[PDB]
Amino acid sequence: MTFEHIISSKRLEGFLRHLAEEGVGGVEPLAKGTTSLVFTGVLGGRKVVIKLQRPDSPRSNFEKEAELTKIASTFGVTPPIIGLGEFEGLPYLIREFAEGEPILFADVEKEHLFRIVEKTALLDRLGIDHGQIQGGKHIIIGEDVYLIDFEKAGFRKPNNLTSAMAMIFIGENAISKRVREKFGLDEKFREEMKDALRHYKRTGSLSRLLSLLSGL
Ligand SMILES: Nc1nc2c(ncn2[C@@H]2O[C@H](CO)[C@@H](O)[C@H]2O)c(=O)[nH]1
Numbered sequence: 001m002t003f004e005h006i007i008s009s010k011r012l013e014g015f016l017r018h019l020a021e022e023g024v025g026g027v028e029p030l031a032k033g034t035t036s037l038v039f040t041g042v043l044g045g046r047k048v049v050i051k052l053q054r055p056d057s058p059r060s061n062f063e064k065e066a067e068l069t070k071i072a073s074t075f076g077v078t079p080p081i082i083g084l085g086e087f088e089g090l091p092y093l094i095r096e097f098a099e100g101e102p103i104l105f106a107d108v109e110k111e112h113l114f115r116i117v118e119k120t121a122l123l124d125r126l127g128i129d130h131g132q133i134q135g136g137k138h139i140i141i142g143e144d145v146y147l148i149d150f151e152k153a154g155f156r157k158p159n160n161l162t163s164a165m166a167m168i169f170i171g172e173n174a175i176s177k178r179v180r181e182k183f184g185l186d187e188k189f190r191e192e193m194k195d196a197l198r199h200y201k202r203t204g205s206l207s208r209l210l211s212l213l214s215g216l
Contacts, residue, residue, distance in 0.1 A: 001029050003037050006056055011088060015052065018087045024048065024094065035061045035151045040097060047097035048082060053090045061151075066093055068128055068150045077123050079146050100142020103168075108141060108179055110216045113168070115145040117213065120160035121206060123147065129158040134167055136175050162197055165209070169193045183216050 003012065016027050019041060027041040030049065035057050039050040053062040072078040079096040086092070100106065103116075116139065123130060131152030132138045140146045147160075168179055170193065179185065189212070196208035 001032065003029065003032065006032075006037065006054055015087050018085075019050065022083070022085065024050065033149070033151050035065050043082065043094070047099070048094050049097050050092055050094050052087070052092040055090060059091075062091060065150050065153065066091065068153045069093065069095075071126060071128065072123065072147065072150060075122055075126060077119050077147050078150070079148070098140045098142050098144070098146045098148070100140045102137045103139040103141050103175060104136030106141035108168075108175075108182070110213070112141050112145055113213050113216065114210075116164055116168070117161065117206065117209060119145050119147060120164045123160045124158040127155055127158060128153055129156050130160050133160060133163040136167065139164065162201060165193065165197055
């Protein structure tokens with residue numbers, strides 16, 4: 001993948017040199033987002049992600065995403081921010097790369113299920129709706145569980161926990177099928193899960209959900 005309809009070849013060359021001067025090497029394109037161009041690199045012997053404002057996107061959109069990403073980083077929901085910068089008037093952020101698999105492709109253990117609850121309930125308590133839980137590409141299952149990529153996030157009544165649990169336990173998809181077979185989940189479990197989620201929606205209580213997952 002290349003970014004040539006968005007940045008000149010000279011701008012890309014300069015950006016890689018600029019990153020190299022901050023110690024970030026072996027930089028490779030990773031994705032094109034709605035707000036940003038995303039790269040991976042190596043800093044201090046470890047993998048990092050670099051997100052650069054797309055010049056053809058509003059700067060305010062990137063700034064909103066960055067503010068939300070910083071809050072999520074402070075509370076541990078997303079991997080730590082390592083540094084901020086600006087190149088040719090474009091802001092960028094550098095964060096740790098979380099080793100592991102997106103939950104769409106991940107082998108999910110009981111500890112991961114508890115951790116997914118803890119992270120999504122925490123983001124709910126922060127009043128931040130991530131916005132892209134469905135599809136399983138934005139929850140990383142690794143040494144810890146993380147949410148990534150806040151381009152569609154905002155301060156609004158959040159759906160992070162309910163969307164994650166519906167995707168894993170209620171909806172029929174590749175993830176929920178794996179989980180159902182791995183944990184031998186049956187119809188009674190699903191009905192209790194629906195009850196646990198309703199309870200959470202009404203009261204904010206995790207008691208019923210954690211009770212149910214503790215039986216796995
Ligand atoms: N394992 C891992 N994958 C990532 C990370 N950041 C971005 N990605 C990949 O990029 C995609 C969308 O950003 C994800 O679904 C992953 O494949 C990360 O920190 N860890």
